[PDB]
C-alpha cells in the first residue's frame, strides 16, 4: 500500500526527508543529549494530526516513554500555535511509560490492540513514538557478553516495530542518545549548533540528499 509522509514543520528537514517521515518505516533520530530528538517527537505528534493537505495524516498517536520526557504542556503549546485545539490534540495521543526494556517490548504488543481498534475509523494510528528506544537496553545489558545480547533483544524489538509500521501503515519514530549494527529504516543524525538551532544529516543513505537541514526549536515545535 502507498506510504504516507508526515511533515516535520521544517521545509528544510522535510526536503532532506523527501517530504516528511514515512509510514511503513522506522525513522531513528540519534544525537547527543540536548540535540532536539524529543522536540522533534513532540512536533510530529501534533503534525500527524493535521489533514494531508497540511502535511499530516489525520492520524492518532501512540507514545512509549522511557525517560519521563513527554510533556503534555509542550504538545499544548505546539497545537495552539498551529491553530489547533490543544485538548483535542492531546486526546489523540495514547501514552505509556515503559518501566524497563522487557515492559517496553511488551508495550509494542499492547499497542497493537489500539491500532486495530482505530484502524478503520477517521483517525487511525499513524505515528508510534519510542523515546528512548535504547536507554533501558543500555542500562540493563551491560558488561562482558552484553553487546551480543543487547543487540539481539534490540533487533527483536525493532522487528516488532517494523511489523506494526508495515502491517498497519504507521510511521515509527524512535530516539537514540549517542560500530554497532542498526536496523531502523532511516537514521538521522541531529546536533545542536547555537541557541534554538539544530542541524540534521542523513546517515548511510547515499541515494538520498547528502546535505544538511537546519531548523529552530520554536513555539510551533520546529520551523525553518
Amino acid at each position: 500500500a502507498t506510504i504516507g509522509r508526515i511533515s516535520t514543520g521544517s521545509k528544510s528537514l522535510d526536503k532532506l526527508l523527501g517530504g516528511g517521515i514515512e509510514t511503513q518505516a522506522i525513522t531513528e533520530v540519534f544525537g547527543e543529549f540536548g540535540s532536539g530528538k524529543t522536540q522533534l517527537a513532540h512536533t510530529l505528534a501534533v503534525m500527524v494530526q493535521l489533514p494531508p493537505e497540511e502535511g499530516g495524516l489525520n492520524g492518532s498517536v501512540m507514545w512509549i516513554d522511557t525517560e519521563n520526557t513527554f510533556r503534555p504542556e509542550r504538545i499544548r503549546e505546539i497545537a495552539q500555535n498551529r491553530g489547533l485545539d490543544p485538548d483535542e490534540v492531546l486526546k489523540h495521543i495514547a501514552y505509556a511509560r515503559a518501566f524497563n526494556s522487557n515492559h517496553q517490548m511488551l508495550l509494542v504488543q499492547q499497542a497493537e490492540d489500539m491500532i486495530k481498534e482505530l484502524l478503520n475509523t477517521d483517525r487511525p494510528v499513524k505515528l508510534l513514538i519510542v523515546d528512548s528506544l535504547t536507554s533501558h537496553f543500555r542500562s540493563e545489558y551491560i558488561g562482558r557478553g552484553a553487546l551480543a545480547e543487547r543487540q539481539q533483544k534490540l533487533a527483536k524489538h525493532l522487528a516488532d516495530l517494523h511489523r506494526l509500521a508495515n502491517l498497519y501503515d504507521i510511521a515509527v519514530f524512535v530516539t537514540n542518545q549517542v560500530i554497532l549494527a542498526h536496523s531502523a529504516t532511516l537514521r538521522v543524525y541531529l546536533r545542536k549548533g547555537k541557541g534554538g538551532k539544530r542541524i540534521a544529516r542523513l546517515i548511510d543513505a547515499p541515494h538520498l540528499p547528502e546535505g544538511e537541514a537546519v531548523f529552530s526549536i520554536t513555539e510551533k515545535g520546529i520551523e525553518d
Binding site: 492531546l90 501514552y95 505509556a96
Partner: peptide, 4 residues
C-alpha cells in the same frame, strides 16, 4: 496506554 491512556489518553494524554
Amino acid at each position: 496506554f491512556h489518553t494524554a
